[PDB]
């Protein structure tokens with residue numbers, strides 16, 4: 582049982598009307614390769630509710646194009662559950678770096694034939710890259726590859742902490758978590774689904790970079806909150822301390838406080854990030870191009886949609902897939918903005934408030 586203190590997110594959420602079609606097709610898609618999925622793994626993929634996640638990001642998008650983003654979520658939720666922090670401990674970091682660079686190369690060069698030493702991941706990734714190239718501009722395809730590099734470099738960072746069972750300092754986690762959560766790689770598909778390139782001049786501008794990092798960090802921190810109970814449910818089944826790779830545990834260790842106080846501090850931070858995102862959005866929207874306005878629309882649906890999906894998906898409530906209701910997370914809504922709109926004392930992210 583986890584009670585999340587009141588979150589400030591005055592943004593509307595909507596679901597895509599074709600979740601069932603998207604679910605049917607993404608299951609049939611992933612079953613078409615050679616991943617040798619067990620019924621347990623197929624059940625857990627259902628619990629991930631990838632159509633509900635990305636459908637909440639792009640609830641007005643055409644179903645056949647949204648399928649591309651949903652299918653990416655399907656295979657990368659699997660990649661995470663099987664190829665991240667798994668396998669023998671000996672040579673684990675080398676194994677990950679090798680697989681990661683093949684995935685990136687296939688996104689750049691779908692016929693690179695980076696072979697199969699018992700490989701399963703690259704065939705679906707190649708299918709995604711080929712499908713994306715039918716719709717994406719070359720710049721959009723570049724953005725996907727680079728966003729995967731940022732995610733994968735962050736995973737190598739995370740795996741170092743997991744192997745040491747160490748807890749990152751808040752200043753380090755605060756800018757890294759957007760990358761370990763694959764925020765940019767997740768959202769890079771959206772402008773391809775939209776079918777229009779966001780101008781580089783806009784995406785690279787400091788105000789849009791701030792908005793991007795604000796949105797992905799908030800969503801990742803919200804994930805730390807709605808996946809916190811699943812973390813405690815894992816630490817209780819393995820009898821170990823909870824992982825330090827989480828905002829709650831980081832604030833607990835950093836403030837020498839108890840779990841309720843840390844949950845409050847984590848939500849307080851999420852609320853200030855959310856308020857800053859909304860405030861900065863208002864200053865950016867007047868001069869935004871139509872593709873940038875669309876991008877900001879997706880980030881605005883991401884924040885409340887991610888929360889709703891995370892609080893209800895069986896991924897965080899029935900973790901192993903055979904324990905209905907093992908974890909229950911509740912959350913409140915704070916209807917008032919944070920009283921403190923100043924930058925937090927976190928130098929690695931303070932420039933979002935510039």
Ligand SMILES: CC(C)=CCC/C(C)=C/CC/C(C)=C/CC/C(C)=C/COP(=O)(O)OP(=O)(O)O
Pocket residue numbers: 654657658661759761762763764767768797798800801804808883887896
């Ligand atoms: C930052 C993003 C946009 C939202 C929150 C992060 C998650 C929900 C995005 C899922 C999309 C895709 C599968 C991303 C790849 C990495 C993925 C495994 C992140 C999930 O967060 P973790 O903390 O690593 O795992 P748990 O949430 O299950 O604990």
Ligand SMILES: [Mg+2]
Pocket residue numbers: 661662
């Ligand atoms: Mg995980």
Ligand SMILES: [Mg+2]
Pocket residue numbers: 804805808
């Ligand atoms: Mg998590």
